[PDB]
UniProtKB/Swiss-Prot annotation, chain A:
Belongs to the TFC5 family. TFIIIB comprises the TATA-binding protein (TBP), the B-related factor (BRF) and the B'' component (BDP1). Interacts with TFC4. It is found in: Nucleus. General activator of RNA polymerase III transcription. This is Transcription factor TFIIIB component B''. The chain holds residues 360 to 425 of 594 of the full protein. It comes from the Eukaryota. It comes from Saccharomyces cerevisiae (strain ATCC 204508 / S288c).
UniProtKB/Swiss-Prot annotation, chain B:
DNA-dependent RNA polymerase catalyzes the transcription of DNA into RNA using the four ribonucleoside triphosphates as substrates. Second largest core component of RNA polymerase III which synthesizes small RNAs, such as 5S rRNA and tRNAs. Proposed to contribute to the polymerase catalytic activity and forms the polymerase active center together with the largest subunit. Pol III is composed of mobile elements and RPC2 is part of the core element with the central large cleft and probably a clamp element that moves to open and close the cleft. It comes from Saccharomyces cerevisiae (strain ATCC 204508 / S288c). Component of the RNA polymerase III (Pol III) complex consisting of 17 subunits. It is found in: Nucleus. Belongs to the RNA polymerase beta chain family. This is DNA-directed RNA polymerase III subunit RPC2. Present with 1950 molecules/cell in log phase SD medium.
Amino acid sequence: TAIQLKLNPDGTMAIDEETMVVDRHKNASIENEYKEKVDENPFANLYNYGSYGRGSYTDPWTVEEM
Amino acid sequence: FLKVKGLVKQHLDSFNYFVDTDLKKIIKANQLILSDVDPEFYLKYVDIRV
DNA sequence: CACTATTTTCGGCTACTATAAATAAATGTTTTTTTCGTAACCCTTCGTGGACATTT
């Protein structure tokens, strides 16, 4: 995403007006487009006391690992 | 004239045009709230109802 | 009627959640200073005449 130039027959070795600065949003835009589009039902985001907390469930141990 | 089209025409038919159509021409001119930090965030207002 | 099978349920596994102590050190988190409308009328300007000095 460096600075680009051009060969104009009128003005040779001229610098272009648009790539002087960067948008910083077009590369973010394509990142968003291949994302999953979900329709929210108010019962999905249900939270309880076991929410926004530490920890997980450890896999129950095996005789191989004993 | 006054049966179909009464005496408070000028007040009733103005607010009723604001609610129906003239809200959707507002959010369509203030859509896409954006942030510059973390540029992959966008919230857009699609339609509005009362 | 035999068993398949999601449903119902037991069940135990796990993992902190407070409550008191030792440090000790690292870490972030938030206040208190230290500094970067008409009408007078003053106001402003263009200007015109007086006398002085050099020069003919």
